[PDB]
From a paper:
Cation-chloride cotransporters (CCC) are central to the regulation of intracellular Cl− concentration and have key physiological roles in neuronal excitability, trans-epithelial salt and water movement, and regulation of cell volume. The CCCs are strictly electroneutral transporters, NKCCs transporting two Cl− ions coupled to the movement of one Na+ and one K+, whereas NCC and KCC couple the movement of one Cl− ion and either Na+ or K+ respectively. All CCCs are feedback-regulated by the concentration of intracellular Cl−—this is mediated by the WNK (kinase with no lysine)-SPAK/OSR1 (SPS1-related proline/alanine-rich kinase/oxidative stress-responsive kinase 1) signaling pathway. Here, using single-particle cryo-electron microscopy (cryo-EM), we report the structures of human NKCC1 (hNKCC1a) and mouse KCC2 (mKCC2a) at 3.5 and 3.8 Å resolution, respectively.
The mKCC2 structure is in a similar inward-open inactive state but with an inhibitory N-terminus peptide in place to block the translocation pore, and with a very different dimer architecture compared to KCC1—together these exciting structures allow us to propose models for the regulatory mechanisms of CCCs and to gain insight into the defects in known human mutations. In the case of mKCC2, using mass spectrometry we confirmed phosphorylation at the two sites in the C terminus (T929 and T1029) whose phosphorylation appears necessary and possibly sufficient to inactivate KCC transport function; additional evidence will be seen below from the blocked pore in the mKCC2 structure. Within the TM region of mKCC2, we noted a helix-loop density that we were able to assign to residues 85–108 in the N terminus, lying in a cleft between TMs 1, 5, 6, and 8. Residues T92 and Q96 from the N terminus interact with R443 and S444 from TM6b, while the additional N-terminus residues N93 and E102 interact with Q524 and R538 from TM8. At the extracellular end, E224 from TM3 interacts with R142 from TM1b to prevent access from the extracellular side congruent with the apparent gate in hKCC139 and above in hNKCC1. Furthermore, analogous to the intracellular essential residues of hNKCC1, R193 from ICL1 of mKCC2 is close to D539 in TM8, forming a polar interaction, and from sequence conservation, it appears that all the CCC transporters utilize this interaction.
Author numbering:
A (entry chain B), B (entry chain A): 85 to 108, 119 to 236, 242 to 336, 366 to 497, 508 to 683, 693 to 844, 848 to 872, 876 to 886, ...
Amino acid sequence: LSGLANYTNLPQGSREHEEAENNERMGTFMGVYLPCLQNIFGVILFLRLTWVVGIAGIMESFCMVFICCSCTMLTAISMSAIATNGVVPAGGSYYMISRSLGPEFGGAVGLCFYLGTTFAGAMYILGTIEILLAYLFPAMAIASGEAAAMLNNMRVYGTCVLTCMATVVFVGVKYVNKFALVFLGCVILSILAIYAGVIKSAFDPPNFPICLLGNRTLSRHGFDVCAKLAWEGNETVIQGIPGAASGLIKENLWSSYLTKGVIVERRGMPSVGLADGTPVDMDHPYVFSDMTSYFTLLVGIYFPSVTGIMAGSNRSGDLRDAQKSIPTGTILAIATTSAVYISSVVLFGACIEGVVLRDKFGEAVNGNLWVIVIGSFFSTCGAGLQSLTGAPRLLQAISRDGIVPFLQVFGHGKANGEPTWALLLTACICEIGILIASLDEVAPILSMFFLMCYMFVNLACAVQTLLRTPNWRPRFRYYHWTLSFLGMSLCLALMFICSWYYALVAMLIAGLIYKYIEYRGAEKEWGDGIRGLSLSAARYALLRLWRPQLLVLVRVDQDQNVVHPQLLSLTSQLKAGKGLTIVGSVLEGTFLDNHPQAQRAEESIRRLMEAEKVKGFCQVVISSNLRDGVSHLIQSGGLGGLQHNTVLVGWPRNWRQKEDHQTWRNFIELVRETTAGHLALLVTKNVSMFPGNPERFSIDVWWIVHDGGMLMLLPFLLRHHKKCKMRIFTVAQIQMKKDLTTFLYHLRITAEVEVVEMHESDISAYTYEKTLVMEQRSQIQMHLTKNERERAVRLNEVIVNKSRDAKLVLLNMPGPPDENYMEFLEVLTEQLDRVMLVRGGGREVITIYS
Amino acid sequence: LSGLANYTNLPQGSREHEEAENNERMGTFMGVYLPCLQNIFGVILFLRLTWVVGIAGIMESFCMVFICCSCTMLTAISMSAIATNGVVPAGGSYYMISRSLGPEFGGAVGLCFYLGTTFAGAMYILGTIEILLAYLFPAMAIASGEAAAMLNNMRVYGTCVLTCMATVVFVGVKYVNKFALVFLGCVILSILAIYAGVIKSAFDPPNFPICLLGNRTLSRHGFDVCAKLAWEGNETVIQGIPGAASGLIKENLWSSYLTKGVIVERRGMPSVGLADGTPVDMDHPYVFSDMTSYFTLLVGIYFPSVTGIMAGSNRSGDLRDAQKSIPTGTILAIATTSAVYISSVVLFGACIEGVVLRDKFGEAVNGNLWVIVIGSFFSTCGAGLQSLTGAPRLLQAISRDGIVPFLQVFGHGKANGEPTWALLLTACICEIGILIASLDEVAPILSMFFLMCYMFVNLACAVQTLLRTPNWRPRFRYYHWTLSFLGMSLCLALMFICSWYYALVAMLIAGLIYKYIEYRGAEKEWGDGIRGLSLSAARYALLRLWRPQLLVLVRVDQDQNVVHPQLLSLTSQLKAGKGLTIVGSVLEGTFLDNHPQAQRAEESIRRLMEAEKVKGFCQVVISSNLRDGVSHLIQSGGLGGLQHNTVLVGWPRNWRQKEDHQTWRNFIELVRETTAGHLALLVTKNVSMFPGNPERFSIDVWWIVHDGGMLMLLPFLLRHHKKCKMRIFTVAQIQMKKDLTTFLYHLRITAEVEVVEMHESDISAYTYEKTLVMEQRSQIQMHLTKNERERAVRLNEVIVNKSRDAKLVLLNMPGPPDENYMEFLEVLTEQLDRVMLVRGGGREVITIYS
């Protein structure tokens, strides 16, 4: 049989995910459209929507229906955005949200959706026997102005039918498997019946009114007359008159005003007159109003009729595509119901005084070809039985995963699915919602749970897009993060409109399970608890993943003692504890023989590191050769994207001292290593006589043609720690003075002067490098506030001492040559006291604060 | 002069921090106690506190004063906790909070405190000319039932005096330096005067009442009589009578009930009688009430009289100790004012009908030896002038640091401190608070700003203690994080009691500067912006800083290709993407010559790593020798506390094949390296024939006497990925079967059997190791759910094949011997198909889920 064979509305659950994953059909969109439509036409269309049309303006209830439509369509867009970033495995919406958001939003969404559905199981079981006591045969339990006796009347019948359909769901769930299609017919025939009844628009059951009252005609069947026969009659009930209008009009209503009664008698708008001035506290045959009916009390009664869209994707796996059927079988399925709730709210501009909630001559809607008062019974029974079976099967899915540890008992089952203890708990926490025993006070409770469940989805699917989580890539139309952010804001606003003093409490509870799952999850994988949390956060911040962040290469003395703490005193003030600093070292060979040496060395360097007030990490490597215990730090510094950008090192002071030292072959191989690794180098020459604690009271930099721009960030970073003047000294072989002055003034950096120096001959030059630098520069904008200049090696001229010997000096090193490394060791320390030779890499974009 | 020489109440600020830090006195506690007391006795004690005693119950206003006392004392405890974890440098409270919390809470506290003080400058300038228009000579600006003409009256005089003391603060701030002591006398003489007046308790200025009315005696000076002379008189104003009580009683009041008027006439509690039933909408000589006076409207009018405690530490640096004077000069200074507000609220149980706000015969308090109506003028002038000078000096301190980038203009000054544009902005945003022009509506605005400023301090100083930030160690009595958490909760509750729809808005604004400072701060130090944020978060989560987190040692083929992806398929299912996994490799030498080899190798291994669904980091090291390119990974794996706990490696398959291979000396040196590094080892023997994607359908472990407990975590981790049975097989040479069965059942792990095997001889044994393990075990509890057992090497018996050849096998390796490493290569692969040899370290606590 095409269609009706193998069709339900109940969700998939836990067992049909276990089967789909252990052993590792094909319904169309029409099997995921109709279940989204079946459980969304609930009970607030048949017996409370016309009261919303009556006890509020049509131009206010239109805005109510529109904003409650947008509040859930803008979340079904996020359901479209979640159904494409993965393989949409099996089970209901819970496994989708869990495997697409981690366990942490999955628990906080699943518990709120469970608390929503387990009060849906109360709100529909409480409105399915109002029909018995108001429209079918009354079987009440007792008079004399008793308005709270109906409360105790409805409690016992509600508890009886709750035990009835909690029994019939435990045994014989194949029965509600079988009856899954007639519950759709009982909705759709009744709604087509009332559209046909509006299309008739001819007849009316008339009412009977007083002068400006309602005169509820339960037993007053004398047809609006005090006395009319051959002799007079009693009709004992008077004050002014008694007319008889016809309520079910068809031509024109113009009921576009808000008439909010407050526990008083109903009144037609200017029928004849009114003439009294006294107390009117009688209890006679008149139709009163139940409670006050302001706006924010009414939106929380309307909102449970637009809920259940994530139960429109509970049929996963059994689809054939499941990545197009979930969006187009929900957005169409929410639009085809929004069309009903918007056309019907203005298409009830035919009745007159539909503000009476219960009855005037005992009829609910009365605009159809008496069908609706039994079609709206099996519909409400089925929508209260779907929310009964579905709710324990969600506790089984939450408890099965071990996401919550004290949810251990509730994954028991009876030999094939069929949750047992979860049905007991949902019966208890539905029973504590049935003792409230009024349909208008369980709706702002149920509404708030579905609002926070819809709000956490929009909060998650907009923060996964900003914070680029790796397994988060949606493949659907729209679903932009601004749209889900508007969904967040709209769901949060409609949460605080309903009841804010419950919104804060039930959001701080739902924002507290999200930390408890994080504690019990960060304990399982790291084994520590309070450290694994911080540790896990570091792992996520690395997996989700200019200014110099450096590795400093100090060496250790004959003991486990550092040899030049002035280098640490220079790197503390170059960087000021703002960034990444790896402080490495290297020892002799064979870790077996020397691990106490490295232990005491890292203890000493960690003692030094906090004394100079620098925040970083130490790594001490034991290696056989001294060279490849440095080239095994440069290649492997930080862990992930925390790569060191540059390497700082001291000059080899005792060069050419020993006979076969080979400690400067180490240095030249280091320079070639750092340059061919695309990495910058900072070598300090006279490592002693650098200031530590003591302050000072003219930093001079020497722009050679290469590697500039880095030459002016470093004094710009040094002056923030203990402040002198600075002298830019460029070299050339004209108009660049004005360009450099405008560049230094456009940054408004400091009091930097400028001197133009022209040298006929200066080595370390190559013209085919700016064309290699511009290929990387163009691969990266407008408003370029960066320094771009248009226009045997002796190096014994050395004009950089005629205006020098004042303060810290900076220069560019020449490029390394190959053989003849001893000829590369030219030393520019003819008279320079302290100097820090720099050498940049290739890719150095220095845009802001250069 | 001892005392009065060099004493102010104004805060320190920006310039006197710059001077204290560029050039790098001695007042006692009495110079930090009295400034905390001077600006806390504001204007709501003299002209609105008695209205709170009158228009609310004394047993409700007592609870009001008590909870507003606790709300700020429980924050001054956090001010004690912040004043000891550092060196309390200079400036006001802003530099303390900034340097002790980072810039991020510092900006969000400084802006809220600035917005609090700049409306203090309005609330005191608006209540300093109510005294002119109600108690001094009226100079009003126009009658005939005009209650809003007083509003427009007060606006122009308030704007005039605001321009007056905004002018006199810009030029001649040495004048308010000079007058800083008389403003304390004008408080303390007046409050001692009213205590002396209560100590008198003898006399009274009497009033004149109607039957049950107040009869405001502005011009009705006929002394409560209709006509009394030799002839009658008019007194034209009647209804019932006119008595004349005496208000200022002394014996007994018993006014302990809440009498909340709502825009009606005042009425004594049962004076004589009342006799009328009609409309009473006249405007005659009677004292009416201004507005409704419910409780949460009144706590937000009382709260601006307990504010200003962080201006009790604005005198930093100029103290001599500053680490004991700040707590004991604030807690005593808040207790000595709480004592006043609690004794005075029950010590106004002497007056009668003090519910009239403005005047009955033109007197404010009238319980002193007329002094108070001028002592409460200079006090309010000084407390409105302190909040004028202080507020721009705080914008200078916020703008100077560059914490906020668009606050660039407001650090201008005039040649020595003296902020100029900040005074213009605080004049404008005080002027938009003076146009509200009512003292009772600028107080729930000002109150909310000081409440969120007090709430962020309690939020910061309780999260710095849980999350162990390194430069956060307080050294003061109490200051426990539960106490500051109660401060958080109490400040948040008193925030939402006042005005919740402004609480959410002005908390989402103050929770939005905290992210803008984080964006503009994480851009300055990392240069990237959106990545530096995540990067910075990783750095903080590492600096703030059992289950195996492993480094796997794969090797690369003749190309840049991996050689055994089954090892990655084993480490994907051993760990399931939950933890840290470093996937290392090693190549030939000389990085210069081989960096494209390492580039393509890490590209290939990163291609493989995501294909097996394992989340980790790859590091590829080029080194000359193949050995110390492995021992330079084991010593330096992860960056900080993300150290790899164990090393996984494949067995050398082609052992003893080449003539001089020396690839197994590598392996034995690896085993000695890993054991003497206190690190665990996992070596897979037959690396091919391990399952990848395909599932399976009897894991057997072999407990040798050493290193157990780890032997049962690994199958317990393997079965969560694709599920067979398991066989525990221990060895001995009795009662341990029952102990092992109770241990395996107490964890309720799986269907593990148990076989006891006894061998007469088995090598790799030493008895003096459990005494070395128990020294580490005792250094770590109760309810020990861990496995603790009480009771030429041949290795050719090999009884581990009589019940074997089924599934994955696990064993303990023997300890390495020294020479004769080729004799250590005994192979237990007589018939075992797949086997993963394990070897633990020393420190393996395996408490939960073993």
